[model samples]
Target: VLSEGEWQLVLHVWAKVEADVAGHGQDILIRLFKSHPETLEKFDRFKHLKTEAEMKASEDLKKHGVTALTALGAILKKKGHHEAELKPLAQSHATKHKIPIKYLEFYSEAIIHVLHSRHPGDFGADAQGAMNKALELFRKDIAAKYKELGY
Candidate 1:
């Protein structure tokens, strides 16, 4: 539920993010694991790692980082109309993945932290606030899917 101005800010932020979606995704996951190592368990490729150094070095992390962000890329393609985009993921993750959906919040936090650090000028209060709401909407949407899926 972003305003028209907020959508403009989002598009501005997206311009910066598109420059290095892969690298940005890597940083996002790195910060995510650092803040919430428990999230590692959600991924089969990374659950075995016991330390940050190992995680950073793992090729698995690199691959999955891009993979995760690619999914994000598609969702972002929907812009403000992400209602349908988030539905299938919730069903799949809940039924097949059965992940703890709360990690979405942590992941959102990681995303915000990365973009803020990478582009201090663009990610000021206005853009940052919009991005936060957008991602929060993402989390709520997926959680709603999980509930409807009876998970």
Candidate 2:
């Protein structure tokens, strides 16, 4: 749904996260688990993590953080149109990972919130709208894939 002009704005701002993918990745999830503790229950890998200290220090969380952020970055690169970035992940989530698709919005919230706070000048509400739209496309892809898989 984004034009090249809009994508340009997004990529320009997205560099903040790309510059420190691991750092921002970890920051996004920590914010999610900390702010919405109930959502943590869905993650078999991270469900056991309770304390903030342990969450930050957990090697598993660190790696998963990078994994998720990397996928998100790929989705953005194609302006969220490429199902290749969304489908396999959706299939896995529907079949095994079992993360409620609802929680995706919370991740989007955490991502925009973290990026905005971390880079106020670059990732403000204007850019937030762009990212939010990009994320919406990702959600529909996952939702449709889940339906196809009978989830």
Q: Give the number of the best model, judged by lDDT.
A: 2
Cand. 2 Cα-lDDT:
0.81
lDDT of 2 by residue, 68-135 (tens): 88887887888757877777899888888776777877888898888877886866666777777777
Whole-model Cα lDDT of every candidate shown, in order: 0.79, 0.81
TM-score of 2: 0.90
Model 1, runs deviating above 4 Å: none
TM accuracy, model 1: 0.88
Against the hidden reference, what TM-scores do the models get?
A: 0.88, 0.90
Clash counts for the predictions, in order:
0, 0
Model 1 worst lDDT run, 10 consecutive residues: 71-80
Considering only N, C-alpha and C atoms within 3 Å, which residue pairs clash in candidate 2? none
Candidate 1, position 150, lDDT: 78
Model 1 residue 126 CA deviation (Å) reads: 0.5
User: Which digits, one per residue and each the tens of the lDDT, describe model 1 over residues 53-142?
Assistant: 887787777787777777776676576577777777887789987777788888888988899889877677988887777787778888
